[PDB]
């Protein structure tokens, strides 16, 4: 899932 | 246009956890397709293009355990999804490039 951290 | 199901939304954001910036940037996502952190998507629902706002998202709607995700968000753009975006279930870059997954 976003955001990509 | 307001953020809602099947809109492709572009946001600019800063993410803090325990007061420290962990991430910042701009992204586009297709709303209503479980493509974003759920608590953030919930905070975005109904927002107008141009709106700036803060959202606190608990871990249980999303980094240490049980920390709050503190977002500062700007809604940059809202538009309707193309038929291909709806079929793929995700947002696509502006330039048409027919494809599948
Ligand atoms: Ca700060
Ligand atoms: Ca999805
Ligand atoms: Ca505001
Ligand atoms: Ca617009
Ligand atoms: Cl997406
Ligand atoms: Ni695609």
Author numbering:
A (entry chain B): 27 to 31
B (entry chain A): 1 to 62, 72 to 110
Question: What do the study's own words say?
Answer:
Peptidyl-prolyl isomerases (PPIases) catalyze cis/trans isomerization of peptidyl-prolyl bonds, which is often rate-limiting for protein folding. SlyD is a two-domain enzyme containing both a PPIase FK506-binding protein (FKBP) domain and an insert-in-flap (IF) chaperone domain. In order to improve our understanding of the mechanism of SlyD and of FKBPs in general, we set out to analyze the kinetics, energetics, and structural basis for substrate binding and inhibition of SlyD from Thermus thermophilus (TtSlyD) using 15-residue-long unmodified peptides, which we reasoned would be better mimics of natural unfolded protein substrates than the traditionally used 4-nitroanilide tetrapeptides. In total, we obtained five structures of TtSlyDFL and three of TtSlyDΔIF at a maximum resolution of up to 1.4 Å.
Finally, we also analyzed binding of the S2, S3, and mutated variants of the S2 peptide to a chimeric TtSlyD construct, in which the IF domain is replaced by the flap loop from human FKBP12 (henceforth abbreviated TtSlyDΔIF). Next, we tested binding of an S2 mutant peptide where the sole tryptophan residue was replaced by alanine (S2-W23A). This peptide retained the ability to bind to both domains of TtSlyDFL, albeit with moderately reduced affinities. The binding mode is the same for both TtSlyDFL molecules in the TtSlyDFL:S2 structure, whereas the S2-W23A peptide binds in two different ways to the four molecules in the TtSlyDFL:S2-W23A structure: one similar to the S2 peptide (molecules A and C), and one in a different but partially overlapping fashion (molecules B and D). This latter binding mode was also observed in the TtSlyDΔIF:S2-W23A structure. However, our results speak against such a scenario, because both type VIa1 and distorted VIb β-turns are observed in our TtSlyDFL:S2, TtSlyDFL:S2-W23A, and TtSlyDΔIF:S2-W23A structures, which strongly suggests that FKBPs can catalyze cis/trans isomerization of prolines present in (at least) both these two types of β-turns. As discussed further below, this variability is intimately connected with interactions between the side chain of Y63 and the peptides bound to the FKBP domain. The FKBP12 flap loop inserted into TtSlyDΔIF in place of the IF domain adopts essentially the same conformation as in full-length FKBP12 in the case of TtSlyDΔIF:FK506, while it is partially disordered in TtSlyDΔIF:S2-W23A and TtSlyDΔIF:S3.
